Design an enzyme around this catalytic site. Structure first.
Site, PDB file in Angstrom:
ATOM      1  N   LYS B  86      -6.735 -12.575 -42.051  1.00 30.78           N
ATOM      2  CA  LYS B  86      -5.830 -13.537 -42.681  1.00 30.78           C
ATOM      3  C   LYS B  86      -5.233 -14.550 -41.712  1.00 30.78           C
ATOM      4  CE  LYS B  86      -4.227 -10.945 -46.780  1.00 30.78           C
ATOM      5  NZ  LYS B  86      -4.868  -9.635 -46.707  1.00 30.78           N
ATOM      6  N   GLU B 108       2.940 -16.459 -51.154  1.00 35.56           N
ATOM      7  CA  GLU B 108       3.036 -15.354 -52.092  1.00 35.56           C
ATOM      8  C   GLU B 108       2.372 -14.178 -51.389  1.00 35.56           C
ATOM      9  OE1 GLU B 108       0.581 -17.503 -52.035  1.00 35.56           O
ATOM     10  OE2 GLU B 108      -0.961 -15.971 -51.841  1.00 35.56           O
ATOM     11  N   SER B 376     -12.600  -6.469 -41.620  1.00 37.08           N
ATOM     12  CA  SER B 376     -11.512  -7.397 -41.886  1.00 37.08           C
ATOM     13  C   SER B 376     -10.144  -7.072 -41.298  1.00 37.08           C
ATOM     14  CB  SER B 376     -11.403  -7.634 -43.402  1.00 37.08           C
ATOM     15  OG  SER B 376     -11.202  -6.429 -44.116  1.00 37.08           O
TER      16      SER B 376
HETATM   17  O1  LIG Z   1      -4.031 -16.334 -52.919  1.00 36.03           O
HETATM   18  C1  LIG Z   1      -3.927 -15.338 -53.622  1.00 36.03           C
HETATM   19  N1  LIG Z   1      -3.238 -15.459 -54.752  1.00 36.03           N
HETATM   20  C2  LIG Z   1      -3.429 -16.747 -55.352  1.00 36.03           C
HETATM   21  C3  LIG Z   1      -2.781 -16.888 -56.633  1.00 36.03           C
HETATM   22  O2  LIG Z   1      -3.420 -17.936 -57.104  1.00 36.03           O
HETATM   23  P1  LIG Z   1      -2.506 -19.206 -57.449  1.00 36.03           P
HETATM   24  O3  LIG Z   1      -1.035 -18.820 -57.253  1.00 36.03           O
HETATM   25  O4  LIG Z   1      -3.082 -19.505 -58.807  1.00 36.03           O
HETATM   26  O5  LIG Z   1      -2.894 -20.317 -56.492  1.00 36.03           O
HETATM   27  C4  LIG Z   1      -3.402 -14.140 -52.883  1.00 36.03           C
HETATM   28  C5  LIG Z   1      -3.144 -12.763 -53.345  1.00 36.03           C
HETATM   29  C6  LIG Z   1      -2.670 -11.766 -52.337  1.00 36.03           C
HETATM   30  C7  LIG Z   1      -2.500 -12.262 -50.929  1.00 36.03           C
HETATM   31  O6  LIG Z   1      -2.092 -11.505 -49.865  1.00 36.03           O
HETATM   32  C8  LIG Z   1      -1.510 -10.223 -49.927  1.00 36.03           C
HETATM   33  F1  LIG Z   1      -2.290  -9.294 -50.502  1.00 36.03           F
HETATM   34  F2  LIG Z   1      -1.396  -9.862 -48.690  1.00 36.03           F
HETATM   35  F3  LIG Z   1      -0.330 -10.175 -50.510  1.00 36.03           F
HETATM   36  C9  LIG Z   1      -2.772 -13.601 -50.641  1.00 36.03           C
HETATM   37  C10 LIG Z   1      -3.195 -14.452 -51.595  1.00 36.03           C
HETATM   38  C1  LIG Z   2      -5.981  -9.402 -47.432  1.00 34.84           C
HETATM   39  C2  LIG Z   2      -7.085  -8.410 -46.908  1.00 34.84           C
HETATM   40  C3  LIG Z   2      -8.300  -8.314 -47.559  1.00 34.84           C
HETATM   41  C4  LIG Z   2      -8.500  -8.927 -48.981  1.00 34.84           C
HETATM   42  O1  LIG Z   2      -8.537 -10.338 -49.111  1.00 34.84           O
HETATM   43  P1  LIG Z   2      -9.816 -11.242 -49.103  1.00 34.84           P
HETATM   44  O2  LIG Z   2      -9.157 -12.519 -49.388  1.00 34.84           O
HETATM   45  O3  LIG Z   2     -10.676 -10.736 -50.191  1.00 34.84           O
HETATM   46  O4  LIG Z   2     -10.387 -11.135 -47.764  1.00 34.84           O
HETATM   47  C5  LIG Z   2      -9.315  -7.594 -47.000  1.00 34.84           C
HETATM   48  N1  LIG Z   2      -9.131  -6.952 -45.809  1.00 34.84           N
HETATM   49  C6  LIG Z   2      -7.928  -7.019 -45.170  1.00 34.84           C
HETATM   50  C7  LIG Z   2      -7.724  -6.255 -43.870  1.00 34.84           C
HETATM   51  C8  LIG Z   2      -6.901  -7.753 -45.714  1.00 34.84           C
HETATM   52  O5  LIG Z   2      -5.668  -7.790 -45.085  1.00 34.84           O
END
Ligand SMILES: O=C(NCCOP(=O)(O)O)c1ccc(OC(F)(F)F)cc1
Ligand SMILES: *Cc1c(COP(=O)(O)O)cnc(C)c1O
Ligand SMILES: O=C(NCCOP(=O)(O)O)c1ccc(OC(F)(F)F)cc1
Ligand SMILES: O=C(NCCOP(=O)(O)O)c1ccc(OC(F)(F)F)cc1
Ligand SMILES: O=C(NCCOP(=O)(O)O)c1ccc(OC(F)(F)F)cc1
Ligand SMILES: *Cc1c(COP(=O)(O)O)cnc(C)c1O
Ligand code: NA
Ligand code: NA
Lengths: 253, 394, 394, 253
Positions: B86, B108, B376
């Site tokens: 990330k 978010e 990842s």
């Molecule tokens: O990007 C994702 N959500 C996008 C929602 O889409 P929108 O709000 O429609 O742009 C999204 C979801 C979880 C995230 O990180 C974590 F798991 F760590 F919390 C980061 C991004």
């Molecule tokens: C956030 C996360 C993912 C899931 O997100 P992708 O956007 O699908 O990569 C996968 N692996 C790790 C270690 C993460 O922190």
């Protein structure tokens, strides 16, 4: 669509603006919602904007957010909403009925099928909150094919290209978010403008009409009355009637 | 109109309220400009190298493949500053925010990893960071919440809706619609409205670019397949990108199967969901027959995104990439296996990718194959989760 | 007799029971042989690069030094696999064990970090690892204990004595005396009997070697001073080594001051202890007026070694290196400052080194100085400790 | 030193081996320890090996480890140990007394000062557990300067160089850890050998003497009797007397 044309023509002959309340279908329950809507109409509503409960209303503030939650707690579904709409139209033949939708509920079982269902129950317009003009093609096309007016939002900072697009693509009414814009919209022959967002007092309704708008839309203010009187159904209707009659009065000449 | 195609086949788009289009258009233009700006590329490269620790290693795992004809390499994003991939893209987005003259960041987060990444990038680059997190996730991720605050980020709990990720996403957007002139919305995966799927891919593609260079150096040829877990799709598309035109290289994305696809408790919308429009995009998603958005379940909180990036849905539709699923138990077994045989504790998210590679190896042990799994992230954060489960079973 | 000098001035030596001398002599000879063996060096380099992630970055911290004439760089050992510098030398010792034909590893651990490092190296290289840990530390370090077991190491609680590190050290030696033919004792710091202080320094010197190359590349000159925390002395001597002959470069070691030197509750034996003979060496140590060994106190468990490496005592005696102390509160302030201004969460151990650099900067803000702090490890492991303290004070 | 020479000469004239028990000074208390020691001597001990409680006895097994802990629980200090030694010597003028020490307690207030104190109270030898021959120079020099015999451990696998060193540097007796070694030691004129470690039965004592050793040392076996009878001081002495007399009997011709 036609119902809006008839309404605005009639309102213009009376030199008055339209007052359009918004409420979530099924909030706080199917029965009370139907009563709420009949009260809004009896109190003076010129048209209605109705929301179908959605799991993620990312375009709505807290008040409406909770309205959807209450509807869901009551087990309200889109199918039940369409049954309510059919009945509302059966009771009120001329009042324009517009829906406030989120794209997935329209796209879910097919865009064409959704608008066909709207036409079947008597809906007049549909505003899809998360569909910008740039992505509107399939939606406005399906709307027009079923004699449904596709409603578009006109931001207060909209540039000339957007104004021209909204003027060309929209029907029924142009949803103007809260003078220059209103004049430009008329210049491009856009559907009559209804100002919405933050309209909660009579003076705001008169101000909108004075600015050249064909009317005003009020939602949160209406819904707030609902949630503050949940424990008192009768008082709820009484206060809704008082608020709507006051708001509608402000639109008259 | 846009400068770049907002769609990958039928998937993608910009399904947001009209009021947010100017923000997306501004972002797209800034991105296009930044991509052809040598100075921006140099600054991004500098941060990736001297702050984040790139390039990351490509580790050959000889112990785990003993007795088979599989050669397995792990792309070590677990060694990146922050412990997960990330970090790459938040640094890029932070630079874009500054390019646009913004001094504030909106983010978010669900499991809290993106929140931490956004917080660290903002701290480094002098940006005021505010993070929206579902109240349910706030209570379940006390450690990450403290990390965010330690780095100066403002963490705002979200109670609306199911009080989870999707609800946090909605709240972040509402804020942005009225503050985009001074604030940038740092979306955390390769999903959402255009230009995010494209921007996140481009700011994660160094994963695949480095992997290609490293595998060519070590093996003198490309991998038979690269494997990555898919929650939202960023680490996977980051690995896949540079290999898309190398038709001989298989691209395998792994969605979480949870308790099993047949149980309905999973997070595999790409292969077991239904196309819908939400999160500002048209893509496969977890939803009721009625069209209400549901939640993705997985032992790994990081893979709980109820939808998936549009480019993955597209690559799947044309057959360029294949997607599969791995259950909680398969992921747990992979987690334990890597710890014991390679001395690396993988994130439970990444363990899903490893589990599938292990299946490819074990099911056909005499098949000659060169595989690369995108590791990842590191799994120190999952120690408690794994411990409680193992104990619960004696 | 020995191949190398067991002493650094008056400090060091091989003060162990006669029965253990053959093990030390064998180890010294294997080390000398390994150091002149290109194949051993190549294998060690390969593991450091492709498994551990070397070289580690040298990060310039511009935010923290704003308004002063101090330029500060952090050597990022926190980015090393495992999260701490300990990984470097355990990999080297593991290779030495194999060179001697041994398949078993014996290790001692206090805070559990060396135990984890020893466990991961053993897992990677196919060695049977058994770790001795004080029962008190076992109960206080549940996370690290689980990590050790996840990696296949056998963890043996020690109740004897104060049931802590020093007690774990004694138990490890007892085992080794009767198993050195097949087992190697992986000592975890630059202390203990010869040849350990020398071996650990040499297997950690890449820290300073890389730092020198990196600072010359970035600034075109050597640092005015390199600063490192001192628990046992390995990360500090690793940083110092390559700079010892560069007389213009100051070498500053930071011992933990705990609640304050005057309170007696600290871990600064080098400057506030008394020379004694224990842990197989002659060196400064925490002891009663009677000669009984005491314990070092510090908010950071990693700096709780009641003595110090003999080479540090020597460098101090001749004035080549200077040693100071930093209190719990000063270390805590540095920890919070790095998190908020650079987006890096430092280990509380490393925070002691940073705290002193911050003092050098703040006390004389107009003094032009180029400083390098060895960021020995990441601080995700200290989140709970810092949280509880901050809360306890409202 | 001289006391050992006299003892071995006398034992040789009687064709018997020496039985030397070990106990930690002050375990389980100063008073009971003094009584324990007098019982060991009255029961037949030819010499004594006495340990001074140390915080980290890394050369001792569990039994002795706990002996030190018990001594510390009683607040026993090195200073009190020397007071005990002075009294033991005042009560028994000819029995050789050897100390088992850890380097820091010897180095603490000065190596020379430690051996001077040993000579002052009447100690005959000192074995520093964690000082290999390679580091013994200052210790054996200070020992000899104060007429104290420096004792060295001879491992069962010791090479020829080590045997020659131990033979040259040691005095009093050579501590042989448990035939060839014994013969080699005599060839190099080393101090008489006493076998130690794991000696807990009469047959082991006779075996040691039969192998050519001048005697045997027993510690853990003795200390075990102490810790198993902590609640019964009287029974403790009775059992110690029985064990020592049996062990000493095994050394006679
Ligand atoms: O990007 C994702 N959500 C996008 C929602 O889409 P929108 O709000 O429609 O742009 C999204 C979801 C979880 C995230 O990180 C974590 F798991 F760590 F919390 C980061 C991004
Ligand atoms: C956030 C996360 C993912 C899931 O997100 P992708 O956007 O699908 O990569 C996968 N692996 C790790 C270690 C993460 O922190
Ligand atoms: O009609 C609704 N609002 C009614 C009144 O607003 P208020 O009185 O402030 O609740 C309404 C209409 C469209 C909408 O979507 C988007 F924002 F995208 F345009 C959200 C709410
Ligand atoms: O090496 C050190 N102890 C040496 C004891 O010396 P000795 O047993 O005499 O060789 C020592 C102490 C602590 C450690 O790691 C950790 F803190 F993580 F537990 C590693 C090594
Ligand atoms: O004399 C002591 N042992 C007495 C008997 O041994 P045991 O009967 O088995 O307790 C004794 C003597 C020396 C010693 O240090 C070192 F190991 F280094 F040589 C440890 C214990
Ligand atoms: C083990 C540790 C130390 C202390 O040990 P040294 O041998 O003095 O380096 C310092 N920093 C970190 C992060 C550690 O884990
Ligand atoms: Na998903
Ligand atoms: Na120390």
């Amino acid at each position: 669509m036609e119902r809006y044309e008839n309404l605005f023509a009639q309102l213009n002959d009376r030199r008055e603006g339209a007052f359009v309340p918004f409420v979530t279908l099924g909030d706080p329950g199917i029965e009370q919602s139907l009563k709420i809507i009949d009260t809004l109409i009896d109190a003076g509503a010129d048209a209605l904007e109705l929301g179908v409960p959605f799991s993620d209303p990312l375009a709505d503030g807290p008040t409406i957010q909770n309205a959807n939650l209450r509807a869901f707690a009551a087990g309200v579904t889109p199918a039940q909403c369409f049954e309510m709409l059919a009945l509302i139209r059966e009771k009120h033949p001329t009042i324009p009925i517009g829906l406030l939708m989120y794209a997935n509920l329209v796209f879910n079982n097919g865009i064409d099928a959704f608008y066909a269902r709207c036409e079947q129950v008597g809906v007049d317009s549909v505003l899809v909150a998360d569909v910008p003009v740039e992505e509107s093609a399939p939606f406005r096309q399906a709307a027009l094919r079923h004699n449904i007016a596709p409603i578009f939002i006109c931001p207060p900072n909209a540039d000339d290209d957007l104004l021209r697009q909204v003027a060309s693509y929209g029907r029924g009414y142009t949803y103007l978010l809260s003078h220059h814009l209103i004049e430009k919209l008329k210049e491009y022959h856009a559907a009559p403008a209804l100002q919405g967002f933050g309209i909660s007092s009579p003076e705001q309704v008169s101000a909108a009409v004075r600015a050249g708008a064909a009317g005003a839309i009020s939602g949160s203010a209406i819904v707030k009355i609902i949630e503050k009187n949940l424990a008192s159904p009768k008082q709820m209707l009484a206060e809704l009637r008082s608020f709507v009659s006051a708001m509608k009065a402000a639109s008259r000449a | 109109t846009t400068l770049l195609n907002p769609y990958f086949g039928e998937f993608g788009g910009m399904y947001v309220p009209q009021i947010l289009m100017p923000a997306l258009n501004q972002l797209e233009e800034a991105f296009v400009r930044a991509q052809k700006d040598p100075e921006f590329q140099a600054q991004f490269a500098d941060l990736l190298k001297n702050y984040a620790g790139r390039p990351t290693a490509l580790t050959k795992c000889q112990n785990i493949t003993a007795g088979t004809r599989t050669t397995l390499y792990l792309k070590r994003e677990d060694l990146l500053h922050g412990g997960a991939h990330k970090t790459n893209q938040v640094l890029g987005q932070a630079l874009l925010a500054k390019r646009m003259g913004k001094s504030e960041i909106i983010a978010e987060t669900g499991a809290g990893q993106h929140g931490v990444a956004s917080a660290l990038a903002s701290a480094l680059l002098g940006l005021k960071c505010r993070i929206y997190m579902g109240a349910k996730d706030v209570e379940r991720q006390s450690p990450n919440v403290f990390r965010m605050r330690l780095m100066g980020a403002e963490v705002i709990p979200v109670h609306s809706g199911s009080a989870t990720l999707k609800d946090a996403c909605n709240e972040a957007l509402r804020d942005w619609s009225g503050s985009y002139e001074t604030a940038h919305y740092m979306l955390g995966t390769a999903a959402g409205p255009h230009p995010y799927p494209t921007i996140v891919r481009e700011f994660q593609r160094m994963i695949g670019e480095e992997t290609k260079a490293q595998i060519l150096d070590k093996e003198g040829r490309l991998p038979d397949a690269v494997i990555a877990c898919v929650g939202g799709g960023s680490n996977a598309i980051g690995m896949f990108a540079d290999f898309i035109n190398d038709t001989s290289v298989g691209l395998i994305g792994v969605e979480p199967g949870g308790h099993g696809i047949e149980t309905g408790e999973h997070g595999a919308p790409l292969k077991h969901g239904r196309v819908g429009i939400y999160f500002g995009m048209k893509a496969p998603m977890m939803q009721t027959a009625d069209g209400q958005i549901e939640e993705s379940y997985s032992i790994s909180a990081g893979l709980d995104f109820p939808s998936v990036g549009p480019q993955h849905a597209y690559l799947n539709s044309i057959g360029r990439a294949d997607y599969v699923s791995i259950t909680d138990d398969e992921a747990l077994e992979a987690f334990k296996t890597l710890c014991r045989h390679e001395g690396i504790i993988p994130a439970l998210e990444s363990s899903h990718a490893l589990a599938h590679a292990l299946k490819m190896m074990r099911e056909q042990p005499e098949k000659e194959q060169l595989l690369v799994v995108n590791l990842s992230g590191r799994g120190d954060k999952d120690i408690f989760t794994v411990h409680d489960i193992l104990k619960a079973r004696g």
